[PDB]
Design a protein around this ligand. Structure first.
Ligand SMILES: O=P(O)(O)C(O)(Cn1ccnc1)P(=O)(O)O
Ligand SMILES: O=P(O)(O)C(O)(Cn1ccnc1)P(=O)(O)O
Ligand SMILES: C=C(C)CCOP(=O)(O)OP(=O)(O)O
Ligand SMILES: C=C(C)CCOP(=O)(O)OP(=O)(O)O
Ligand SMILES: [Mg+2]
Ligand SMILES: [Mg+2]
Ligand SMILES: [Mg+2]
Ligand SMILES: [Mg+2]
Ligand SMILES: [Mg+2]
Ligand SMILES: [Mg+2]
Lengths: 362, 362
């Protein structure tokens, strides 16, 4: 896509600025500058750029209906690309740390960053921290004199905190809340009582929906100066809805999508994750099915994982996803219609975003 | 100390606000709220609070010479305490991740956070990320309407980036720059050619001096509105000088100070760290001494570590530290005199800070 390649050309500008700054202000050597360049490329590139291209899309919509000088149009489009890369870099930060915590093997067709022989977990923790730090370097440099700077930084902080809190919920989802204790080693749940739709929704809300949909949509509004033209409560509600759906897709693919086309290998069953599939399974399974689930879930053994996948296949969870998808379509369609009242162009942006999310196969 | 207990009372206010916010806005359960409370206490408390009490000290100095209403004095002191805890929380973030990267056992008399049975490395990475995130939650809430907010957030970002870049230099200091490659596993240096005073100074500058001394001193200036009353170039120069000295102390204690009084166990020799002792050793050792160093450094073997410690003891590095200390005293004394020209009260603050740093035994 031509639009996506212009977005990538801004990445090259950002990379050039960040690496020249390390050279000029941080006394870096060429070899460590090379390392961070490879680090930036491996962690930030290779994806679909859904979050980044959302910011551009929202801004392009308002540009079509609002009067600007040609140079102002160039300013806003460049702002949208920079703001888009802030989110892609923020995602990169979370992806790097997430892979370590989940013990993942590959990220978009390549080994996870920490799996690289010359990286290891030791370097990867700090590399992830650097990635988040770059987002702030970007904002202060590029959006220095911009009126949206204060609001952008404030939202970015809240969204980032929400994700970190969300990851906390996710990484401790396979153990009982009442047994949580830093002093005593955490045993895996036996009753799976916290594997409920309500608890699943809490985890997903904070761990993905804030940075995956809320941030890109409001970012595009900030760079367009069009936050007043929308009802924010609707933006929150529609972002959390498509965001949840996005993670449900992710949960299904973790189990049923082959790694060659997915770009990752699944670990949810092995990690005993509170995924959509496990929650939906326990929401329809009979007594014996539950007992077989309890005897095989949360183990690295290929034979035990195979039993869990078999249980999912026999429990017809494909019909449950279709029923869930049909409901999401209803509610997203409803919210897009509500968004048309004050901003039809933003409602169209959400419609495009939803279409891409709904149709995705990776 | 009475002053230190009033500083700790603000921590309780901050902890109450952060935990009530998780309850009211982030849908947290009491058990996970308890976990993060223990996490906050274990990672932020138990230290000397040098960085935190520096902010208070700088502010107290200006309060003694400037006219304010009684309520304004209460405002500034509370600001100084909150700004002080932002740094203590920022240090906590770096301490949590640093211990994982260095494979450390104890932090201030207690097991490192990741060593806790109910924590592990998996949870600790995110806990550290949460700690940094809390610093921004603090700033936006407490310093919302303050005129120094923009400058505080901008400096905090630069200081944080500098530290992360510094940790990168530190964690890769035992391998050759020209051999750095994410694709190929990193072998330890054989010539130790990058163990120079100049390279040591670069690492220390970025990994500690920015957040340990620069940030607390300027933070106290921001809350006092007294940044104009100082020459910033002097503040930079004096903070990087005492900061370097502070890390040299840390390097010496890692080897020669017993864990019972230090609160940590040393790992520098085992990790093959570019510490002051190793650099100073290679700067005076004869051919045979170097060869024995090369055959024993960077190994977990107690016998090999013992040989390295013996080499340090025989090379009389105590006389080298005394010679280094005497030079630092000269240059710190010089800079404090230069600070008296525009702000004598800030110069006194630095003198107190230096006295505490110079006299410290842990
Ligand atoms: O399933 P996860 O949440 O770990 C994941 O979606 C990443 N992630 C982490 C937080 N939100 C999303 P991925 O499967 O991509 O590893
Ligand atoms: O020696 P390090 O740099 O690892 C240390 O001083 C922590 N640190 C990390 C960066 N700056 C300081 P500590 O010995 O306290 O573990
Ligand atoms: C489910 C989440 C939020 C993590 C994966 O997100 P993406 O599917 O956007 O990953 P990339 O395309 O960026 O690799
Ligand atoms: C050398 C550095 C910068 C890490 C230790 O700092 P401190 O000696 O201040 O650690 P605490 O007292 O805060 O535990
Ligand atoms: Mg994962
Ligand atoms: Mg995960
Ligand atoms: Mg997943
Ligand atoms: Mg350490
Ligand atoms: Mg260290
Ligand atoms: Mg040390």
């Amino acid at each position: 896509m031509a639009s996506m390649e212009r977005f990538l050309s801004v990445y090259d500008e950002v990379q050039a600025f960040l690496l020249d700054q390390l050279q000029s202000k941080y006394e870096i050597d060429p070899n460590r500058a090379r390392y961070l360049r490879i680090m930036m490329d491996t962690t930030c590139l290779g994806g679909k750029y859904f979050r980044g291209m959302t910011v551009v899309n929202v801004a392009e919509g308002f540009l079509a209906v609002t009067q600007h000088d040609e140079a102002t149009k160039e300013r806003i489009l460049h702002d949208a690309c920079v703001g888009g890369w802030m989110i892609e870099f923020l995602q990169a930060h979370y992806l790097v740390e997430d892979d370590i915590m989940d013990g993942s093997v590959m990220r978009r067709g390549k080994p996870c960053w920490y799996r690289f022989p010359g990286v290891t977990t030791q370097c990867a923790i700090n590399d992830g921290i650097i990635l988040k730090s770059w987002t702030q370097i970007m904002a202060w440099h590029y959006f220095a004199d911009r009126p949206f700077l204060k609001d952008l930084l404030c939202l970015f902080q809240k969204v980032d905190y929400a994700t970190a809190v969300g990851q906390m919920y996710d990484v401790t989802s396979m153990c009982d809340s009442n047994k949580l204790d830093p002093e005593v080693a955490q045993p895996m749940t036996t009753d799976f009582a916290e594997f409920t739709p309500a608890i699943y929704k809490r985890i997903v809300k904070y761990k993905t929906t804030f940075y995956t949909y809320l941030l890109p949509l409001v970012m595009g509004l900030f760079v367009s100066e069009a936050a007043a033209s929308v009802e924010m409560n609707l933006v929150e509600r529609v972002a959390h809805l498509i965001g949840e759906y996005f993670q449900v897709q992710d949960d299904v693919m973790d189990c049923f999508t082959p790694p060659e086309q997915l770009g990752k290998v699944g670990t949810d069953i092995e990690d005993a994750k509170c995924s959509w599939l496990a929650v939906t399974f326990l929401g329809k399974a009979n007594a014996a099915q539950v007992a077989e689930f309890k005897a095989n879930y949360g183990d690295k053994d290929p034979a035990k994982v195979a039993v869990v996948k078999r249980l999912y296949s026999e429990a017809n969870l494909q019909a449950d996803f279709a029923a869930y998808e049909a409901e999401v379509v209803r509610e997203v369609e409803s919210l897009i219609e509500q968004l048309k009242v004050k901003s039809p162009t933003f409602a169209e942006s959400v419609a495009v975003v939803w279409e891409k999310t709904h149709k995705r196969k990776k």
